[PDB]
Every structure is written in structure tokens, then in C-alpha cells.
RNA sequence: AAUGUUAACUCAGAACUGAAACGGACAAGGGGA
RNA sequence: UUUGCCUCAGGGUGCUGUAAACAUGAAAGUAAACUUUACGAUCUGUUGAGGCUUAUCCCUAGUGGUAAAGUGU
């Protein structure tokens, strides 16, 4: 099954038929959402590091 | 011991019984033909031949093992089996 | 008029759907009861292609529905036998609907069609539409 | 009371008791009868299961649907190893039915015929008819003019010959095959010639005539009712399982009546096939008897493959309709029919137009051995 | 004696064994027994069917 | 505005191929008036 | 129960069906070097050829074995 990650990272077991649980059952949509506010975050709290954006167009985007 | 060159079929003598049995079935007649054909009543198997038997599983046996079969003196007779290993079977006739 | 009606083999018991393939304005024939079946005790009468088959419609024209009529089973699923040495079989399982003397009351049936109702009735032989 | 819905009864009590028959061999319980008019020929015969096959062919009745049209049917074709004859037997009506007034033997007799009188034959000392074929021939002359004077149906003691077929059986099949025709004065010499030699069936075997045939069917073992006399299978919900009758019996009579279908044995019992018309005469060395002259090629009555369970086929062949009862190496015996017909197939001509060779086993692919190997040619 | 070609295969008809099959559309489509219809009846192709001579008819293996 | 070190499993379309069949076993709602 | 029989083998009819390898072969198309180089469900030619085929298949005076004769009359 190390060879069978290889070869899902490959491209071929992409197929919708090994899929024994639903979408927030292989990864959890609350953690994904969770990360992406993080890593939106670490970008909007850089700009501020930077001063590239001011704190008026900041709190908007 | 005789100078004999035979074969045993055992698929022709599990041909009957279930999974379950199978292996044990061939050891008991690999013993009865044994004991029959060198008209003796002490048979007393090798490990290495119920390694063989064994290691395919007990579901199939090893269909086939030829027997050239030799006795020892020391009622008094009793015998031991042993069995010759070729790739192919066709051709090879019975004899002395 | 001569009642040489040759074996056939037995299938098709009572209370199977079959398709109708006619333009009677019917779709599918429920086989009720077949004729010349005497008296077995638990044995479901079943249809043979030379017998008439007494059957209702269940899907086609109001007209024929909600009633029995006869109907010439014609393309069998099963195997029947002949001298040929050779038996014949088909994949739809159909009738066409006659009237009680025996003639067609369609004017064409779009698959195969039986020969033997052809002599047996003989308004049959000219509306053969396309015998196998 | 009344049962609400009547129905034929499971079985025929016309074949009881259904149990095991007592030998293998097919006995005959009535031959065809005499006449004094017809000729003194002969009355049976006896053979192996040779094959119960097709043959492709036309009907000749009037007004049938096929008629003039190719037709397929089912005949069979008999294994005949000659009959060795080698006693004669009299019998004389009284009373108490017909009884051997004497037997004799051939003064030379065969050893398979002798391995029959033994079970253990290979330690025997083989002592029987040893002493019992010198006898001379005033003795002879003079019971057979006491036959002749006395004795009224004649009989023949014929032995098949195992040893021609491949079955591992030695001993002979003895049977005695009845002797029909006229009066004893023209009898007498017309038993006086074929006393020693062998049986080629095509010597009274003759085309358009009626042939019964008897056997020992299969055997099964003990079964249930449902297989012994096919009764209705109860319903699912049967608490002490559903392959039995439900009822046996009223409550009176207090017994269980003969008629109730109970388990036991079915199959090796005695059978017996009749209006089995015969129709075609041939021989075993010849090359073209069972082809026509509109099949124009070459087979003789060889089989292909093998026969399963049977070997190989090395003897005479005739033509017969129908198929036969028993299983593979079982001996069938051949009776002529008991009152000829006149009817229209009772005296119908017939003729074949072609013969199977093919793999008789299963589902084969080649008719005969040269058509397999020409097809191909060009192989490994 | 005159026997007929096969359908699906190329070998002659012996009366006696046969059957037939014939599809909706009426064709008559003769073949010898119930492997020799069904093989057709499975919705196979005989271009990829290798143990018949259709096989060897296509790969030019004469 | 760009170039280097290092950790995911979610999608999508071109293939041909395999006996036109595939949550391949285990695991699992029959629906409707 | 020794012109046998058991076993084995030469086959035979068969069953699925194409079997063990070769590929400076194709091999959907993939990646690494200055045209060649690492995989790739299969087939192609040897491959209408293997594995199994009586234990209840068929043939073979083919060869190995075929044994103690204990009981009753």
C-alpha cells in the first residue's frame, strides 16, 4: 500500500467508487474551514506587519 | 527394501471429502497404501513428507508425489516413506 | 381444416405478461386461462403457440381493456421441439388478439409471427406479416 | 367424508412390491407364442447395450404433417457378441405347469460358460463339466425320441461370451431362449443341426417386425417418497420437515393399507419396454451397412471418443427403435414381439437416410476421427 | 448429404441436436447447440472470441 | 515584483485497455398510493 | 485374484480455454540526459498452446506389485 499511495497520488484510483464515507467524514469541513481562517489570518495580520494595506481597506477585506 | 518406481495420486483419493479433511484424509491414505503395498503393518511417516502434504493447505493437498519406497528389517519389518521430487510427470513410466 | 398440430413445448403459465406487437391498439396481454387444458390437480395451465390463450389487457386502448379476449401466443422464450431436429425459441415473450373463430383481429404484427395458426385458422395465412 | 378435489393416485400398484430384483440378468416371464401353421425358426435372442441414438428419416403415413419433409426419430442399435448355444432343454405341460422332462449338453463346452457354475474360480480346480460330456450317443438318440414324443416346447440354453466385451466380468450370462414353429416331427430335425456353433443375430432377426426388450434398471438406494412415487412436497412451514405424506391412512380400517407410497428402495428393478419394432439388419466388419447410399461416406458402426463408462464397441449391429432401460455394461435381453400386428406401422416399410458417428460424450465437436484431424491438419 | 453452415461458427448442421434462436428483428440465426447460441446470446463478439476460426479470420492466422 | 528549503487529499478532463463488467470480499434502507 | 486386477505411465476424447519466457516491440501515455535513456491493465510470433482430465471416462501381454491362507462342511 505504499506503492498504491504512489499510484492515488498518481491518478488512477481517483475514481468515485472508493469513497465509503461522506464529504465531513475523510476530512472535516469545520477543521477545513478552521485552517483556511488561519491561513487568511497569518496573511491579513503580515499585511499589517508590512503596512502594504492600511487598517481602513484592512478591516474591509 | 525393493527397487520399485511408482507415483501416488492424491487427488483421485480426497477426490470425496470436504476442505476440512483433506490433508489428514492423505496422510491416513498415503499410510494405507504404504502399509498395503510393502505388507507391513509399522509405517511410520516423515515430517519432512507431512511438511509437503501440509504447507499447500489443508483445502488442496499436493495432487501428486512419486513413491520409490524402501524397507528396513529392524513384527520385525517396518517401513518409512519417502518420495521423489521432478518437474514433469508425463513420460516417466512404472518399473523396477 | 386438418388438426395435424404437431408436439409443442410447455411454458408461459397463467398470470404472465407478454408483450402484444400488433396494431390492435394493445401493449401487453395477462394470460388468464389457455383452452384444451383438462384437469390436473395443482397444475397452472400454461400457453402453447398453436393454442388460443384467454387473456386481459393491461396496458393499451380502453377500448380493449378491462375484459378477456383470445390471443395466438406467437414468439415463445422457451425452446419447443421439431422433427427438424432443431427446437426454436425467441427473446419476446407475445400474442396478437383473435377472435374466438380463430382470425386475426389485427391487420399486422410487427415481429415474427407462427406458421401453424396459419393452416389452423386459415384468415391467419394471409395476414402473416413476416414469418421466421 | 369425500376428498373435495379427486386426483389420480401416486404410482402403479401393477409394480409391487418396489424392491430390489434377486438377479442382473433380464428374465422372461412369457415367449411368444406357436402356431402350427408358421415355420419352426427361432424365438428370441440376447445382446449388450450397444446405443439408444437417432436416425434421420421420412414418414410415409397418409395425410401426416411431416410425411414427405425430413423427420429426426429415436431408434437403437444392439450389441450382439455371438451367443454361444450350447444346451437344449424340454418341457411337457401337465398341471402344475410345464416342467423339464431333461437338459443336454454339448459334448464340448466353453470355459467361460464353466466360470459361471463357481464363485471362487480362481482356486477351483475347474472339475465341473469334466465327466459330464462323455456320454454316448444311444442315450441321446434316446431321450431326444422321448422328447419328441413326450416334450412340447423346446428350449436353448445359449451362454454370452464376456471376454469380446471390455467388462471386467468373466463369467458368462446363461439364459435359455425358447425354440417356435411346427410339429414335433418336423421340430425334431430342425433342432439337429446348429447344437454347438455360435449365434449371428441376423440369421431370424428380419426387418418390420416388433421386438420387446427387458432389463434391470438403475439403482438409487433407499429414497424418500417424494422420488419413489413423486408425492406433492408439503409446505415450507412443515414442522417435522415437508418431504413426506401427510396422512397414510383413514383412521379405519385400523392399518396401514399397501397402497400408502412409503420410502424404501427405488431403481434395480425388473422392466420390461414393449411394441419395439425392429428395422434394419447389419454385421459388425462390414464398412457401409449402417450408412446409406445417399450419405456417401465412410463410418461403420464405430463409435468416437470412447464410450463413457462402456469402452469400445467391437461387434454386430442391427437397427431397432427406442431406448433402453439400465445403466452402461448392464446385459439387456431381446424378445421378438407376442402377437404381430397388422396395422399400418405394424407393417410399415422402413429406411434410414443418415447415421450418427459423433462424440457421443456431452457436447463433442467432431464427428468422426478423420473429419477432426483434416479440419486442422497444420498443428502442433 | 447437404448440411448448412453455422451463424456464429462455421461448422455444418447436423439434424438432430440443434435449437434455435432468433432476436426481435426476425432473422433466422441458426447455430448448433446452447453454447454455440449463447456465446452470441452474452452480446460477445466473435472478433474477440479467440477459440473460433472467426478469431482466425481476423488476426490472418490461416 | 521575482527566484530557493519543506508537510495535504479534494476536484476536473484526454487515453486506451479488461471477457461491456466492477461500494468486486466484509460491510449494507425495498419503495409508492 | 496372473491372456486378469490395482497402481503408474504412452496416449485419447475432453474441460475450461491462449498456458511457463523473449522483447534496440507496440504497449494509452508517464520522466532524464545531450537522438538515446527508467514504467506501461494486453496482445502480437513460438501460443487453437498449458493446468486438470476417474476417484464411477476410454485404449495399452507397457511395465511396478499382486500378499498370511484363517473358518465351515
Known amino acids: 500500500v505504499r506503492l498504491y499511495k504512489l499510484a492515488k497520488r498518481k491518478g488512477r484510483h481517483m475514481g468515485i467508487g472508493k469513497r465509503k464515507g461522506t464529504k465531513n467524514a475523510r476530512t472535516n469541513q469545520k477543521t477545513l474551514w478552521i485552517k483556511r481562517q488561519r491561513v487568511l489570518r497569518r496573511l491579513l495580520k503580515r499585511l499589517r506587519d508590512s503596512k502594504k494595506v492600511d487598517r481602513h481597506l484592512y478591516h474591509s477585506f | 527394501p525393493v527397487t520399485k518406481f511408482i507415483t501416488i495420486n492424491l487427488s483421485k483419493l480426497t477426490h470425496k471429502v470436504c476442505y476440512k479433511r483433506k490433508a489428514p484424509r492423505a496422510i491416513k491414505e498415503i499410510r494405507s497404501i504404504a502399509g498395503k503395498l510393502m505388507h507391513t503393518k509399522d509405517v511410520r511417516l516423515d515430517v519432512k513428507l507431512n511438511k509437503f502434504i501440509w504447507s499447500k493447505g489443508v483445502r488442496n493437498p499436493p495432487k501428486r508425489v512419486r513413491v520409490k519406497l524402501e524397507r528396513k528389517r529392524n513384527e520385525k519389518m517396518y517401513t518409512i516413506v519417502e518420495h521423489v521430487m521432478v518437474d514433469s510427470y508425463k513420460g516417466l513410466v512404472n518399473e523396477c | 381444416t386438418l388438426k395435424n398440430k404437431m408436439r409443442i413445448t410447455l411454458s408461459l403459465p397463467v398470470g404472465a405478461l407478454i408483450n402484444c406487437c400488433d396494431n390492435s391498439g394493445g401493449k401487453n396481454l395477462y394470460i388468464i386461462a389457455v383452452q384444451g387444458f383438462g384437469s390436473c390437480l395443482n397444475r397452472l395451465p400454461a400457453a402453447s403457440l398453436g393454442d388460443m390463450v384467454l387473456a386481459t389487457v393491461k396496458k393499451g386502448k380502453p377500448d380493449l381493456r378491462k375484459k378477456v379476449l383470445n390471443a395466438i401466443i406467437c414468439r415463445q422464450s422457451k425452446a419447443w421441439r421439431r422433427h427438424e431436429g432443431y427446437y426454436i425459441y425467441f427473446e419476446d415473450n407475445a400474442g396478437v388478439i383473435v377472435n374466438p373463430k380463430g382470425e386475426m383481429k389485427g391487420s399486422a404484427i410487427t415481429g415474427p409471427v407462427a406458421r401453424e395458426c396459419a393452416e389452423l385458422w386459415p384468415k391467419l395465412s394471409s395476414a402473416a406479416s413476416a414469418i421466421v | 367424508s369425500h376428498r373435495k378435489f379427486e386426483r389420480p393416485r401416486h404410482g402403479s400398484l401393477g409394480f409391487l412390491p418396489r424392491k430390489r430384483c434377486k438377479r442382473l440378468r433380464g428374465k422372461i416371464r412369457s415367449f411368444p407364442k406357436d402356431d402350427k401353421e408358421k415355420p419352426p425358426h427361432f424365438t428370441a435372442f440376447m445382446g449388450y447395450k450397444a446405443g439408444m441414438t437417432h436416425i434421420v428419416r421420412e414418414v410415409d403415413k397418409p395425410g401426416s404433417k411431416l410425411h414427405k419433409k425430413e423427420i429426426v426419430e429415436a431408434c437403437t442399435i444392439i450389441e450382439c457378441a455371438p451367443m454361444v448355444v450350447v444346451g437344449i432343454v424340454g418341457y411337457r405341460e401337465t398341471p402344475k405347469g410345464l416342467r423339464i422332462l431333461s437338459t443336454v449338453w454339448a459334448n464340448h463346452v466353453s470355459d467361460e460358460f464353466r466360470r459361471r457354475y463357481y464363485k471362487n474360480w480362481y482356486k477351483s480346480e475347474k472339475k465341473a463339466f469334466t465327466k459330464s460330456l462323455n456320454v454316448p450317443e444311444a442315450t441321446k438318440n434316446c431321450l431326444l425320441k422321448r422328447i419328441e414324443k413326450y416334450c412340447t416346447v423346446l428350449r436353448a440354453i445359449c451362454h454370452t461370451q464376456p471376454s469380446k466385451t471390455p467388462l471386467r466380468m468373466k463369467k458368462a450370462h446363461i439364459m435359455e431362449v425358447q425354440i417356435n414353429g411346427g ?104 464398412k457401409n451397412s449402417a450408412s446409406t447410399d445417399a450419405d456417401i461416406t465412410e463410418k461403420k458402426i464405430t463409435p468416437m471418443g470412447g464410450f463413457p463408462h462402456y469402452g469400445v464397441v467391437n461387434e454386430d449391429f442391427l437397427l431397432l427403435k427406442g431406448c433402453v432401460a439400465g445403466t452402461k455394461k448392464r446385459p439387456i435381453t431381446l424378445r421378438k414381439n407376442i402377437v404381430p400386428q397388422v396395422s399400418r406401422d405394424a407393417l410399415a416399410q422402413v429406411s434410414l437416410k443418415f447415421i450418427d458417428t459423433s462424440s457421443k460424450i456431452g457436447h463433442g465437436r467432431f464427428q468422426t476421427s478423420e473429419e477432426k484431424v483434416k479440419y486442422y491438419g497444420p498443428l502442433k | 448429404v447437404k448440411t448448412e453452415a453455422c451463424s456464429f461458427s462455421e461448422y455444418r448442421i447436423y439434424p438432430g441436436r440443434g435449437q434455435k434462436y432468433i432476436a426481435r428483428d426476425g432473422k433466422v440465426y441458426f447455430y448448433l447447440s446452447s453454447k454455440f447460441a449463447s456465446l452470441a446470446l452474452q452480446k460477445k463478439k466473435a472478433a474477440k472470441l479467440r477459440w473460433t476460426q472467426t478469431w482466425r479470420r481476423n488476426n490472418k492466422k490461416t
Open chain 4, 183 to 286: 410339429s414335433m416331427k418336423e421340430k425334431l430335425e430342425f433342432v439337429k443341426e446348429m447344437l454347438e456353433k455360435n449365434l449371428p443375430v441376423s440369421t431370424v432377426f428380419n426387418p418390420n417386425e416388433m421386438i420387446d426388450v427387458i432389463s434391470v434398471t438403475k439403482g438409487h438406494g433407499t429414497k424418500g417418497v417424494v422420488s419413489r412415487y413423486g408425492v406433492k412436497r408439503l409446505p415450507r412451514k412443515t414442522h417435522r420437515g415437508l418431504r413426506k405424506v401427510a396422512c397414510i391412512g383413514a383412521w379405519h380400517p385400523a392399518r396401514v393399507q399397501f397402497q400408502i407410497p412409503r420410502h424404501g428402495q427405488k431403481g434395480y428393478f425388473h422392466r420390461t419396454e414393449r411394441n419395439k419394432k425392429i428395422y434394419r439388419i447389419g454385421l459388425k466388419t462390414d
